[PDB]
Each structure stands twice: as C-alpha cells, then as structure tokens.
Amino acid sequence: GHMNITDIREQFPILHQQVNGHDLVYLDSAATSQKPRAVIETLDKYYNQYNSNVHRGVHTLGTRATDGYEGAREKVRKFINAKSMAEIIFTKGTTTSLNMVALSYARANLKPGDEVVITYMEHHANIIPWQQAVKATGATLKYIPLQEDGTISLEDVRETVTSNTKIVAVSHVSNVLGTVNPIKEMAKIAHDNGAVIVVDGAQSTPHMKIDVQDLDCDFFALSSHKMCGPTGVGVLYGKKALLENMEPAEFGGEMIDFVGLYESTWKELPWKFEAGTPIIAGAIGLGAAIDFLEEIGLDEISRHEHKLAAYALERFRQLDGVTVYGPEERAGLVTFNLDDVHPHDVATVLDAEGIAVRAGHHCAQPLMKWLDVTATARASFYLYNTEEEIDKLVEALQKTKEYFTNVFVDLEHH
Amino acid sequence: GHMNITDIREQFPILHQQVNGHDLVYLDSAATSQKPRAVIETLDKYYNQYNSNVHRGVHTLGTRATDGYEGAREKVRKFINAKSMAEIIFTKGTTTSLNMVALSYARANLKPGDEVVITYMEHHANIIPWQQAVKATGATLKYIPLQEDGTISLEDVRETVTSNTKIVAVSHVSNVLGTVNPIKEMAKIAHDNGAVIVVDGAQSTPHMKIDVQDLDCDFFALSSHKMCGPTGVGVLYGKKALLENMEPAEFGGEMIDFVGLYESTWKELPWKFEAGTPIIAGAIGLGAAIDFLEEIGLDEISRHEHKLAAYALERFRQLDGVTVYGPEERAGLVTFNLDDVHPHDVATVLDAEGIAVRAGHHCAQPLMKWLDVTATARASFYLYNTEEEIDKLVEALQKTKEYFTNVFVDLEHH
Ligand SMILES: Cc1ncc(COP(=O)(O)O)c(CNc2co[nH]c2=O)c1O
Ligand SMILES: Cc1ncc(COP(=O)(O)O)c(CNc2co[nH]c2=O)c1O
C-alpha cells in the first residue's frame, strides 16, 4: 500500500466531471485508458517547442525531435526488458503489430501441413490475421480448448501443439475473462515443438510488469492507448534474430537504404519496419506514459487491481441473478450478465447513473459463442479506480434489476 | 491579400523561440508542418474531456468520442470534395495509404504483362510499394521521363502509358522540384488506356485546394503532419466502387461483421479498412487543422506561397554560384546547391544562424540521380513564413559561400 489513489486521480482531469447529473464513474479502461497530465503536457510541449521531422543530421529542432523519438524507443525497451532497441518497433497499435507478424513472418514460414495454434478466448486482433495467413498459405488453424472456468490447462496446450505447429498465438490477459494465461510455460511448450510464440499483450502491458526475457516470447504486441498513452501508437517486440529474417510489411521512405529504379535495400532494425514519417508525438507521449507508470510502479498498480478485482467479485456474488464469467484469480475486470436483462440495456441504465461500462461481444465472438451468450457487460478497472466506484456499480446493478423486474410486473398486469 | 501573416504566426507557439542565439527561421515545412493553438488545444480538450473508445452505442464519453472521430471523417470528405464518407479511410500517413493501395488493389489486379507507370520525381513512398507489387505479381514497372525543367509533358505520359498499363501512380506536387503535375489530364490519359490513377498528394493537400471529383483521381493519399495536423495520421481516398472490390490490408476488430472460427465477414466502407482501435485523437486534430486552414482559405495560402516562391526564386538568382532545381512555376519550396559546398554543411551553417532547412536526397534517390547530384539543400515554406525569412536565408547563403570560399583561400596558402 504505497500509491495514494487521491493523488493519482488528481492527475487525470477527465475524471472530474459529471455525466447526466452524476459524478463520472469510468469503468471502461479495457476499452481505453485515460491520460494523466504528464502525458498530455508531453504532447503539448512537443507541439509547442520542438516538433520537426526525425532522423535528422541537421537543424536543432529536428535533432530534439529525433532524440525524443528514439529516447522513447529506449524507454519502451527498458519497460518490457527487451535486449535491444532493434527489437522495439513503433506501430499504430496492437492490431497492426499482430498483422505485421502475420504478413511478414507467418505468410513466409507457413506451408500446407503447418499449423497455427490459437485459443477460443482471443481478441479478434489475434484471430483474423491468422485466419487470413492460413488461408493464403494453405496451412491449418487450430484452437486450444478452455477449462470450464475460462482458463487454459498446459496439458491441452501440449495436446493441441504438435511437431507441425509453427506458430502459437495467445493472449497474455483476456479482455473478457480476466484470465492471466501461463505465457512462459506455453512458450516453453511451443519452442519444444519447433514453433514460435506470439503474445497479445494489449491487456497485460498496462496493468502488470512485462519481462520479455523471462517470458521468452518470440513476439509481443501492445497498445499505447490502453496504458495511459496517446491513441494511434503501439509496439511490436520481436526477437532480433527473427526480425532480421523477416521482410518489411510496409515500404517507402525512412525504411530504405538504397533505392534503385526497380530494386531497393532496407535499413537495419528497427527502422526496416518503420516506413514513412513516424508517429513522433504519440511515441514520445507513450514514453511519458511509461515514465508515469514506472514512477507509480507496475507492481503497485497490479496489487491495487488485485484488491479491486477481489472486492468486485465478492460484491457481485452478493447480487442475485447476476452471472460473472471467468476465473477467481484474474486481472482487474469483471464481465457479467444480469438475468433477463440485455447487457446493452444494463449499460444504458448505468450511463444514466454516470457509470461507463461496455456492452457487446468485446471483439471476441468465438468466446461469446463458447460462453453460450450473445453479448455481455463489462466493467474494467485501472489505477485511478476505487472501491467506492465499485460500490456505485453494484448498487446501480441492484437498482437496474429491481427497475426491470417491476416494470415487467407492472405491465404484465396490463 | 486577406491573410494577416502576423496574426497567423501568433497562433503557432513554436515559432517564437531562439536557436543558437538567433530567432528561429523554420523553412522545413515540406519535412513537417508546425501546429496552431487550435489543433494542440483540440488534442488537449479530447484527452481532458471526452476520450473513450469509439463505435459505441453506450456511455456518454464514448458517444462524444465517436461523434468527434466520424465528424472529423466528414470534415475530410468535405475538404477534398469526396462524394462519400465511405471513400475516406483514416490511416497513419501517406506512406501507409499508398501501401494499402499497392497491397489490396495492385497485388490483386496485376498479372504478367501488366504495367505500373510512375515517374522519376516520385517520393520513395510512391516507388517502393509499386516495386514490391510488380515483383510479387510479375508485372512491369515503367517510368515517365521528365523534361529538362523537371516537368512532365502529356505526350510522354501518352507514350509511357499503354493498353497494358493498369496503374499510373504520380505525385500531385513534388517535394523536391516544386513541380505541380497535370493530375487531371494524366487521369484522363490513364482512364483512356484502362488504368486507374493513384495520386500522392502529401505535398499538395497542405498548400492548395484538393477536389478529387475535378481531378477524377481513383486514389489520393495525404498526411496530417504536413498540413498543421497531428503526427501519425493520414488519409486514403479511393473511389467507392474500387474500395468495395478491394480486400482489407489489415485484419482484426472493428473492421469485422461476423467472426467464425475460420472465416469472417467485413464491415461496410470505410470501416472495412480500419482495423483495431483507431487514431481517435489524431483524426479529431486533423479535423481541427482542416477547420483552421479552411477559415484561412486554401486559395489565400496558395497565393501567399506563390508570392513567397517568386520572391525566393528572384533572390536566389541574385546569388552567384547557386543552382536551383525545377521549374519557374512551382509550389512553395526551393531545392538548390551551393557551388563547391556540400548541402549538409550548408544546412549546418544555416542552423547555426537559426535557419532550419533540410539537406540530403529528400527520399527521392532516383530523382537525385536524374539531377546528376548526390544530395541537395531545400528550404520549404508554409502559411507562417515571410519574405523577411527568405531574406535571412539568402543572406546566410551569401555568408556561407564567402566563409567557405575564403577559408579555402586561407589554408590553400598553408
Ligand atoms: C486483448 C486485446 N487484444 C487486442 C486489442 C485491440 O488492440 P488495439 O485495438 O489495436 O489497441 C485489445 C483491445 N481491447 C478492447 C478494445 O475495446 N474493448 C476492448 O476489450 C485487447 O484488449
Ligand atoms: C510527396 C511526398 N510523398 C510522400 C511523403 C511521405 O509521406 P509520410 O512520410 O507517410 O507523411 C512525403 C513526405 N515528404 C517529406 C518528408 O520529409 N521530407 C520530405 O520531403 C512527400 O513529401
């Protein structure tokens, strides 16, 4: 207990407003995170003082912009404990990162008979690129089954991954179930069968320490907007030996060395994978978000979210007619459904109380079908959320159930 | 003469600072543009007040974020006079836009015998994707020759484009020569031969009115960072009938309709081409930049730059031992070389005087080889630049030539 939630919330201006006459209760951070003043003011200082194109060699502002951009790259490398800045590629988000792996690695290393292994809980960003890659290569897509509590057993991984598996793609933390998957053990299993492992870390990176050397993941993808950083920015980490043999996914300026009429050569890593003017301000702001989270401490944030999750699970179990999906040990989110109430109505009623949650399939339709549901509601937490906000959520859920129950009993007597 | 350059410069905080003890003279807007307070404060208001993920249906902040994002899309449609918002795709920049055309259109519509026709003046962003597409399809890449003044004659276009040409890719305005290419006539020629036309408008969009219906371009690409907007944002316009038949370049959430285990269906345009959480803040800020430029008036900006260019050409012709490349009628930039002085040294010396220019190949190596030079220096203008800054530039060039000349004559007597 070191982080002061009041002092933390003070730095997020967007939290201090009312919606529909109620204080805002933002419980949708798995959709996107809010930003502290440090990040916004970093963007401000960039645009006010030293914006210029990068990879300079000349004027002063351009040198400052380049120093900021590449310094943000080093901040990311340190943040996820990569060995080298050559392994840190700035992208526009997790989805693009995974698509780059699918185009530049998968489509070049898949033949008929090869297998791509994923799971039923994957976000669409970690499903559709593999569907398209196996369709383009004639390979086979396989799914690791889930336990009844929404977890993955290592025996099922060993059964699904075979000597024909070349890629295992798996989420670090599920944006729906809250499950934290055994990424390190799955990486060992994939390597034992001759496969690489691609980790979707969009939901893990904001909330827990990432050590790619301890995870031994071959690729790791993350999104800035979920971790207090600017929108439109993400990272692809890849083992350097793998990135060296992969061809670029995009072509143009900045990523070339020599350009002839018909043939060209590429720059060294990481710039080989960064075509065109890069996301300068967004990457610098992501570096600022990393500084912010590191000063608070990712372990502290994870402990705070563990307490929030345990509190929320207990208080949800106090509600009648509410079903929660996923395991007991979980990240900081709760996906649920009210008996006989569609989750979109739940979320509308909650917004009328100032509470922001998300209703729908959460970009995980195969998981919804596995859960035997059409849609769900989800309240997700971050470092600025409190137990009082969870109390407001559970009270609003009780009031929602009562309201729908007795308008039903009112006009069934009509 | 309606725009007041003092009142315009007042809105750009970054211009009001010193570099190396001299007032900043920023003449590098072809590399990237500076931002007015309207754009920066738009980003601020987004992150301070209504950041949330988009394509909602539920809570209030999410609705406001979606309204901002799609309203920016409509602003772009109006700005370039597209028929429909379905034709406006948000990307991370011109380079990505052109790569999307090359992957989703070119690689699907090119067979052996087909031709992709480009020009010798193209930026690398409008060269390498076509190189890779013709290599992947076995098609042929052809180059339209240039006149001695760096312009393109329509007869050379008719000679190069044949009945086997399926794509003509050409820059609207050259970032090196300042040439404004006859895009409308070239589009007529390409359509007469059964080809589509792809327009690289990265350098035209910030400085002159764009009317895609009058140009009749099939694709048009632009970058936000060159037109007073945030970094990491761009637009791909494509004729709707063409975009409907093109498969997505990226896959994941937000761009799907139904997702099965092995097959999926895509959303309608434009969202079919926008995978993952989009560039929300950057797109809203690009809309703000469009509002800013429209309130000033693109025709006014073009007239101001025409005067700046004529003034600069005249004053450059007053300098001995300076060569300027390109035609007399031009956009607002001057690419040049000092006799017996490497342009990187020119640009270093100028930065010591507070003047920001760019030295190098400007991501146009085939053009440099066509010019029979290794590198060039370039001063590029925008709406905040003045004739006094051009005076400072030409005086600093005279002083550079004198300094190098007589340190040469000093230590040749050594
Ligand atoms: C696990 C996981 N993978 C991939 C993505 C998508 O990456 P991005 O969009 O490219 O930043 C998300 C975002 N998840 C959600 C986005 O909105 N609701 C969500 O649950 C995610 O949670
Ligand atoms: C004509 C032209 N096409 C494409 C691009 C690149 O697009 P983007 O990088 O994806 O925004 C540029 C940027 N031109 C320059 C960028 O730095 N110096 C330049 O001359 C350009 O001027």
Strand order of the largest sheet of chain A: 4-10-9-8-7-5-6
The CATH architecture of the largest domain in chain A can be named as 3-Layer(aba) Sandwich
Largest interface: A-B, 89 and 89 residues
Content of β-strand of chain A: 15-25%
Largest sheet of chain A: 7 strands, mixed
Q: Could you say which small molecules are bound to this protein? A: the ligand Cc1ncc(COP(=O)(O)O)c(CNc2co[nH]c2=O)c1O
Helix content of chain A: 40-55%
Structural class by sheet pairing and helices of chain A? alpha/beta
Give Rg of chain A in angstroms.
Answer: 23 Å
- CATH superfamily of the largest domain in chain A, by name, is Type I PLP-dependent aspartate aminotransferase-like (Major domain)
Keywords (chains A, B): Pyridoxal phosphate, Transferase
GO biological process, one term (chains A, B): cysteine metabolic process
Family (chains A, B): Belongs to the class-V pyridoxal-phosphate-dependent aminotransferase family. Csd subfamily.
EC number (chains A, B): 2.8.1.7
